[PDB]
Design a protein around this ligand. Structure first.
Ligand SMILES: NC(=O)c1cccc(NC(=O)/C=C\C(=O)O)c1
Length: 187
């Protein structure tokens, strides 16, 4: 429930990694700051989920770093809780009801997701997400579908808009995502 926020200096390698990724598609924005969110209990629950996923998915690289735009007022909620059940920015559209994450930052930089606040600042997290093994989503999902109807325990881990060339992923569970970095920027 408790956490720390550490601002990255522009000259730190970590700053540059995050900024470079963001700027692949968001170079016309101006980055005001980049912070690392340190929430030990959330990190520990996320690592336990990764350890379980890594034990079951074979060679799959279960983790992706993806983007999530949100309004200024959701930042304290995400910082304490991650993208949990009460997170007001969960969405229910063509790929299911859950939390939506973008492969590319420009998608999250849309004003609909990273709403500019009264000072014009926009907020996009760069999030460790356990994408695991995924399939094509659909509007009815609140959890991902089962992989094999002949042994329906094991579900897909996430769903996506396009299995072989994804642009977004939907995660349905708490502790499937860790809000590692917060990028504050403007137009
Ligand atoms: N909030 C986000 O940054 C984000 C990331 C990826 C996708 C979306 N999209 C949606 O919330 C809804 C529908 C969709 O893309 O088709 C938002």
């Amino acid at each position: 429930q408790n956490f720390c926020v550490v601002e990255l200096l522009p000259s730190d390698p970590e700053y540059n990694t995050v900024a470079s990724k963001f700027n692949q598609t968001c170079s016309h924005f101006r980055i005001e700051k980049i912070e690392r969110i340190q929430n030990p209990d959330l990190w520990n629950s996320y690592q336990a989920k990764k350890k379980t996923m890594d034990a079951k998915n074979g060679q799959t690289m279960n983790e992706k770093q993806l983007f999530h735009g949100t309004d200024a007022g959701s930042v304290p909620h995400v910082n304490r809780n991650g993208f949990n059940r009460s997170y007001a920015g969960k969405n229910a559209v063509a790929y299911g009801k859950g939390t939506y994450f973008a492969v590319n930052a420009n998608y999250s930089a849309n004003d609909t997701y990273s709403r500019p606040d009264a000072n014009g600042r926009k907020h996009v997290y760069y999030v460790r997400v356990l994408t695991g093994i995924y399939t094509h989503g659909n509007h009815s999902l609140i959890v991902p579908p089962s992989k094999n109807p002949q042994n329906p325990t094991d579900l897909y881990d996430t769903v996506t808009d396009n299995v072989h060339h994804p642009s977004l992923f939907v995660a349905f569970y708490d502790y499937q995502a860790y809000p590692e970095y917060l990028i504050t920027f403007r137009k």
